[PDB]
Design a protein around this ligand. Structure first.
Ligand SMILES: [Cl-]
Ligand SMILES: [Cl-]
Ligand SMILES: [Cl-]
Ligand SMILES: [Cl-]
Ligand SMILES: [Pt+2]
Ligand SMILES: [Pt+2]
Ligand SMILES: [Pt+2]
Ligand SMILES: [Zn+2]
Length: 213
């Protein structure tokens, strides 16, 4: 009955086409994709989101939740941000979760959950805000601190992310940590750390799904 769309942020590989302009959902355009960041050791964001995304997929499949991925590999060109949102909407999912990692100041540590604000539809106004709050409480529960450098108590309501703007179904974009920070990068570079993030993500997704039914 349940369908969740998981979006491991960024592509396995990029070419010049990532510079092509795509609609933002509020007028104007932005680049199709961004390369993403990396840890000081060179562990790329695209691989972190992909590996953590697979763990989240495994956890949701254990609950009998049908999952869809925004991309099927971590080594080739992937879809633009507008295509990912249109792909997700076409599935009429119960929840959409995008996974990212940030590139912030070295002392900046912790997570932030991004959601579309001001809202462009009733789903963005209510259910997506409830989903963001639930997810923020779950990451804090896995021992991931609320970001000390961005957002408000681990939340960031914002208008500039095309994927969030274009969503017709509950959708959030989770920045799991700062790849440039020693504590967050040590978690990201470890299979146990990636599993810890996936456990928080499944708890947030399940918690939200349990309120909508
Ligand atoms: Cl509406
Ligand atoms: Cl709050
Ligand atoms: Cl975007
Ligand atoms: Cl986006
Ligand atoms: Pt189910
Ligand atoms: Pt697609
Ligand atoms: Pt974006
Ligand atoms: Zn990113």
């Amino acid at each position: 009955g349940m369908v969740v769309f998981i979006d491991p942020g960024h592509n396995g590989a990029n070419d010049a086409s990532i510079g092509r302009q795509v609609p933002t959902g509020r007028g104007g355009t932005k680049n199709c994709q961004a390369s993403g960041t990396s840890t000081n050791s060179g562990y790329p964001e695209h691989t972190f989101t992909w590996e953590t995304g697979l763990r989240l997929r495994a956890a949701l499949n254990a609950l009998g939740v049908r999952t869809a991925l925004s991309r099927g590999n971590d080594n080739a060109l992937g879809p633009c941000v507008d295509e990912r949102a249109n792909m997700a909407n076409a599935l009429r999912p119960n929840a959409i979760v995008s996974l990212h990692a940030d590139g912030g100041p070295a002392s900046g540590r912790g997570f932030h959950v991004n959601y579309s604000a001001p809202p462009l539809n009733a789903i963005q106004a209510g259910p997506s805000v409830q989903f963001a709050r639930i997810m923020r409480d779950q990451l804090q529960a896995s021992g991931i601190p609320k970001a000390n450098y961005i957002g408000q108590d681990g939340l960031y309501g914002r208008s500039d992310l095309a994927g969030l703007n274009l969503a017709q179904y509950p959708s959030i974009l989770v920045e799991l940590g700062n790849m440039k920070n020693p504590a967050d990068s040590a978690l990201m570079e470890s299979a146990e750390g990636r599993q810890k993030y996936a456990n928080a993500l499944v708890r947030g997704v399940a918690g939200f799904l349990a309120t909508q039914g």
